[PDB]
Design a protein around this nucleic acid. Sequence first.
DNA 1: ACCGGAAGTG
DNA 2: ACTTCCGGTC
DNA 3: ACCGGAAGTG
DNA 4: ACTTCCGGTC
Lengths: 95, 95
Amino acid sequence: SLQLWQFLVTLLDDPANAHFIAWTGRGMEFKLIEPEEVARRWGIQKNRPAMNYDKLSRSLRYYYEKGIMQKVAGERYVYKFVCDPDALFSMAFPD
Amino acid sequence: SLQLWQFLVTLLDDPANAHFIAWTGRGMEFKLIEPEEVARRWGIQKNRPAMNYDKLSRSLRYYYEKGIMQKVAGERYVYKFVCDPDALFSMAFPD
DNA sequence: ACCGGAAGTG
DNA sequence: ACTTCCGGTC
DNA sequence: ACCGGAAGTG
DNA sequence: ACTTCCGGTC
Ligand SMILES: [Ca+2]
Ligand SMILES: [Ca+2]
Ligand SMILES: [Ca+2]
Ligand SMILES: [Ca+2]
């Protein structure tokens, strides 16, 4: 079953979702255009009725410690997957 | 009559006030230890019944544009008078 | 907490 | 020369 | 808006 | 592997 970061990649890959979540075109950077719609869909995925962006974003922040994501500083709702050796290892072989 | 920055200097000079506002000892840096007490006293000074730190701090921020103050980044309630040529001119000859 | 736009006041 | 309000961002 | 501590859950 | 809550800071 899908971890949050994997679920986001499935959303980002499909043009059907571009109105609420999209790759920006710079490396692996992405924007949660409608972050509450991303949250609603993650909530459905996990059977979490009350999921919202506040709580979703906290898991994104935990990904900073895991080394697979970073915030794009000063860009609203914009994050990026990290392009570095530790990030690829963690994403290639998720536990 | 006293401008905000002058009134603060009068407070900072007197040891009687050290519990709510004090020079930190680094150049002209100072801390509003109890910022609402600073606000209450500024309010009395200006006959502004409802003065608070939110509104007082906005005038401090206007002083950034005037060039006589700066925030000390990341230090709670800590500001400094600027030590540079424009600041001294503005403080020596206030309009 | 902090930032700055916007509109206001003898 | 601020005051008030307030939307936006570590 | 964003940050991270703290305590929680099949 | 997050979820929930929430105090703190541009
Ligand atoms: Ca921005
Ligand atoms: Ca490593
Ligand atoms: Ca601090
Ligand atoms: Ca000059």
